[PDB]
CSV table of C-alpha atoms in Angstrom, one decimal:
chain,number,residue,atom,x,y,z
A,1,UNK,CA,21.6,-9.0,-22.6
A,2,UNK,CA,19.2,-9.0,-19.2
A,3,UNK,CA,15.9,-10.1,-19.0
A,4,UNK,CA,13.3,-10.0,-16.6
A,5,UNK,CA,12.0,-13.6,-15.0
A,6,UNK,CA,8.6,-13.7,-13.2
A,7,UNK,CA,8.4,-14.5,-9.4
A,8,UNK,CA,6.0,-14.5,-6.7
A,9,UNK,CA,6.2,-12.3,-3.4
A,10,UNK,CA,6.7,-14.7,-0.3
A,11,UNK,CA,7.5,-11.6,2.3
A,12,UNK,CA,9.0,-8.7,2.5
A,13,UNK,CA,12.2,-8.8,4.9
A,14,UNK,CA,13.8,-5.1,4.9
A,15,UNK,CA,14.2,-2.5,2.7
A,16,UNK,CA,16.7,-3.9,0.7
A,17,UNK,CA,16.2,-7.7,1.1
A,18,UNK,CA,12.3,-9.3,0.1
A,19,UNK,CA,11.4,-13.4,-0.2
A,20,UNK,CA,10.1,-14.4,-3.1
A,21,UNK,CA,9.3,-18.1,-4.8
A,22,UNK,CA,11.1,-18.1,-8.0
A,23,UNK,CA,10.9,-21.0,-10.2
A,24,UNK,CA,9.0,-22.7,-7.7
A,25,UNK,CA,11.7,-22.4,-4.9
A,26,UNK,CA,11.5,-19.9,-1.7
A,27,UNK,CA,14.6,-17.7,-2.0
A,28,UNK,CA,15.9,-14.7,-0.2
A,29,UNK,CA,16.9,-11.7,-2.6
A,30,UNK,CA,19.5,-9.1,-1.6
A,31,UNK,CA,18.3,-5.9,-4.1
A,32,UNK,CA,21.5,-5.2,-6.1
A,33,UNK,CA,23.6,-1.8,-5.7
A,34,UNK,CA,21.8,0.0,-3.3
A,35,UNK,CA,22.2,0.2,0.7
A,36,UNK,CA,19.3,1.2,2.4
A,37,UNK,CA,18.8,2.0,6.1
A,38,UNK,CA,18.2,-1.5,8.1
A,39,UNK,CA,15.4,-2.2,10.7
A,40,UNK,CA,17.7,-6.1,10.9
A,41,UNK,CA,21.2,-4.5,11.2
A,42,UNK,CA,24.0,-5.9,13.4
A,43,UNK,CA,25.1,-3.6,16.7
A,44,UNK,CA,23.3,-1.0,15.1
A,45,UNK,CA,20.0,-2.6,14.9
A,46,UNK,CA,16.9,-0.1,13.7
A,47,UNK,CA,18.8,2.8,11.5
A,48,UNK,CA,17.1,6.5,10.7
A,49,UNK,CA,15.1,6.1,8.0
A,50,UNK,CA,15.2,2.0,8.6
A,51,UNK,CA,11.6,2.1,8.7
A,52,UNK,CA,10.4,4.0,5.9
A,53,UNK,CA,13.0,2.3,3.6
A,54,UNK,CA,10.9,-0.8,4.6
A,55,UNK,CA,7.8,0.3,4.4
A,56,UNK,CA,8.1,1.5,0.8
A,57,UNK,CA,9.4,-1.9,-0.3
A,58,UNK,CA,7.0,-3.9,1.3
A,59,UNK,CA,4.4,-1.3,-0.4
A,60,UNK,CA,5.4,-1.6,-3.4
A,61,UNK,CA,5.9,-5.3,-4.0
A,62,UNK,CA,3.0,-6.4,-1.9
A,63,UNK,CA,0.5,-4.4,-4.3
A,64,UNK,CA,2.5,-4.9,-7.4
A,65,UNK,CA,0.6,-6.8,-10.0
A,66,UNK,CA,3.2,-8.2,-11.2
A,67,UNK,CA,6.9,-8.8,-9.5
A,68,UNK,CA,9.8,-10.1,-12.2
A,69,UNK,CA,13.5,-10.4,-11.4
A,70,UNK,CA,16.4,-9.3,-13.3
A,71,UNK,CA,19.8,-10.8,-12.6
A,72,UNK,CA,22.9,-9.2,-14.1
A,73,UNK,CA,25.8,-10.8,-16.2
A,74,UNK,CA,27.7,-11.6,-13.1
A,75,UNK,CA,27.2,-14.0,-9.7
A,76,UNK,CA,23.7,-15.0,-9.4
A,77,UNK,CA,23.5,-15.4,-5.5
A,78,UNK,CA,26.0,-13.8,-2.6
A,79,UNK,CA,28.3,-15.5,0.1
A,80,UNK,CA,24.9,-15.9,2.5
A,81,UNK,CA,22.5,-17.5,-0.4
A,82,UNK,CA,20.8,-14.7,-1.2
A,83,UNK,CA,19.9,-13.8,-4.8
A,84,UNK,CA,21.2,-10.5,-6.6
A,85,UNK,CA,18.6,-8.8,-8.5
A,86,UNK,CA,17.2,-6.1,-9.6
A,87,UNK,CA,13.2,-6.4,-8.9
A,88,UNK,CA,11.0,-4.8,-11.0
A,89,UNK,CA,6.8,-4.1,-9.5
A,90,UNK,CA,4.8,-3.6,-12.7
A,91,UNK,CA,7.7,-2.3,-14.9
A,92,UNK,CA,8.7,-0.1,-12.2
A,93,UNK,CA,12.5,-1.1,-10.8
A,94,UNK,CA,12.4,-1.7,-6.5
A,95,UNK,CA,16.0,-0.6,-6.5
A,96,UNK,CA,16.3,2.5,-8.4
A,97,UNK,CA,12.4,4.0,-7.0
A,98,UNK,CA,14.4,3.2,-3.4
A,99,UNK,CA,17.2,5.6,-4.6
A,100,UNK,CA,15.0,8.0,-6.2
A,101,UNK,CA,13.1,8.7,-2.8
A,102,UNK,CA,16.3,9.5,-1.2
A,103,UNK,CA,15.2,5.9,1.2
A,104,UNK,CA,18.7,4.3,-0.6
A,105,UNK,CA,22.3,5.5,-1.4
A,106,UNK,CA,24.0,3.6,-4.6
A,107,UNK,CA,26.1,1.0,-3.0
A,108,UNK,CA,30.0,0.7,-3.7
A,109,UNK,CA,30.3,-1.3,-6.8
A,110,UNK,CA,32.6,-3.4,-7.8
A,111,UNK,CA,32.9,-6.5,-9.8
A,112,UNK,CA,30.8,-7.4,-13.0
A,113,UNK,CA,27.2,-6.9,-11.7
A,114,UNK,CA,27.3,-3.0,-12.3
A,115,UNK,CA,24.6,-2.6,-15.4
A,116,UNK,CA,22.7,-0.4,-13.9
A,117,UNK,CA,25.2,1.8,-12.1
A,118,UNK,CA,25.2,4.9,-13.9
A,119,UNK,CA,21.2,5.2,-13.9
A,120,UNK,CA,20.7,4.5,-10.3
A,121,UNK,CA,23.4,7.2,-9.5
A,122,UNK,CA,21.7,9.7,-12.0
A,123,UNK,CA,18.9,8.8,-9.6
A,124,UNK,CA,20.9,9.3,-6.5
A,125,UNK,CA,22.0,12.8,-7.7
A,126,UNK,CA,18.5,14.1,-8.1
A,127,UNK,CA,17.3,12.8,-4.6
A,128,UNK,CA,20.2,14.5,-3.3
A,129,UNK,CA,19.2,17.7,-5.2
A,130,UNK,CA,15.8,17.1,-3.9
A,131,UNK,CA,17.0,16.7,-0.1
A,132,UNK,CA,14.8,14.0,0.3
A,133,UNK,CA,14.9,11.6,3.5
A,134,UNK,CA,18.2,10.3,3.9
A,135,UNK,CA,19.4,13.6,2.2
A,136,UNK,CA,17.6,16.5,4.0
């Protein structure tokens, strides 16, 4: 079964990548199974809808309450460090409110950290159906 740690918001970085002090160490987490326009993206640098995507995570973690961190069953950090996660501000999950917006697509998954898959792609669908941001 998951459960949700607590942590503390350091910074926001992008829209799908925020700094946070969990269990008393800084740590860069990488928001698991979604890819969201990037403002810090290689060659292509600032992306359409880069910006917004950003602003809505920084939004909604820095006046969260209360941040907590969910890891799934599977690798707890990626090649670069960073730690997979889904983030939750006040009961309310970063990831899937990203997708939801139409500010995040559902990322190819593979491998064991997939628990949430099905939801954020029920999520995805809507958006779509919506024609919101990245969709209209």
């Amino acid at each position: 079964k998951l459960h949700k740690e607590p942590a503390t918001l350091i910074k926001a970085i992008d829209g799908d990548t925020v700094k946070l002090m969990y269990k008393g160490q800084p740590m860069t987490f990488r928001l698991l199974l979604v890819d969201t326009p990037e403002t810090k993206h290689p060659k292509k640098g600032v992306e359409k809808y880069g910006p917004e995507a950003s602003a809505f995570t920084k939004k909604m973690v820095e006046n969260a309450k209360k941040i907590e961190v969910e890891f799934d069953k599977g690798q707890r950090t990626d090649k670069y460090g960073r730690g997979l996660a889904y983030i939750y501000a006040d009961g309310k999950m970063v990831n899937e409110a990203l997708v939801r917006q139409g500010l995040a697509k559902v990322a190819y998954v593979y491998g064991p950290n997939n628990t949430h898959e099905q939801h954020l792609r029920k999520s995805e669908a809507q958006a779509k159906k919506e024609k919101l941001n990245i969709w209209s």
